[PDB]
């Protein structure tokens with residue numbers, strides 16, 4: 001009957017990467033950090049690293065493919081990111097096609113493009129408001145400085161530590 005969620009922060013607390021270069025953000029990113037109001041640390045079966053590949057289509061929206069190793073198989077999900085209100089911001093394509101999804105926002109918070117990135121996502125599904133922040137790495141490992149920054153930025157949006165996880169590097173599928 002009931003769900004309880006930490007509220008999405010106001011967008012004014014989410015920076016946008018200045019001068020965003022869509023072409024340079026393309027390619028494979030490993031998710032080295034993951035935080036959000038629906039993300040929970042689980043020492044029982046710790047979360048395994050997955051990857052997200054961004055490809056710019058001719059119309060400039062992105063074809064985003066995520067690949068995860070689950071049940072001994074590689075599982076692929078594709079979504080389309082459509083340029084939104086400002087460079088570095090996106091909305092989700094073919095939303096009708098997702099049952100219950102009424103809003104989905106993507107905001108690139110910061111990236112140097114060839115090593116790391118921090119992306120904020122907010123969506124409203126079945127009337128519940130979810131938000132998450134991904135710390136992307138061009139490699140599966142990042143400095144402890146970047147990880148700490150991600151932790152501070154996640155806390156600054158209301159998230160406690162048990163809502164921040166560092167997926168464990170694997171070789172299956174994401175290589």
Ligand SMILES: NC(=O)c1cccc(O)c1O
Pocket residue numbers: 052066077
């Ligand atoms: N549901 C998923 O498996 C998923 C994977 C990567 C990125 C996302 O936004 C997702 O929702």
Ligand SMILES: NC(=O)c1cccc(O)c1O
Pocket residue numbers: 036037038039121122123130131132
């Ligand atoms: N699973 C989630 O909590 C979530 C939150 C914001 C955006 C997304 O794509 C998500 O998948």
Ligand SMILES: [Fe+3]
Pocket residue numbers: none
């Ligand atoms: Fe999602």
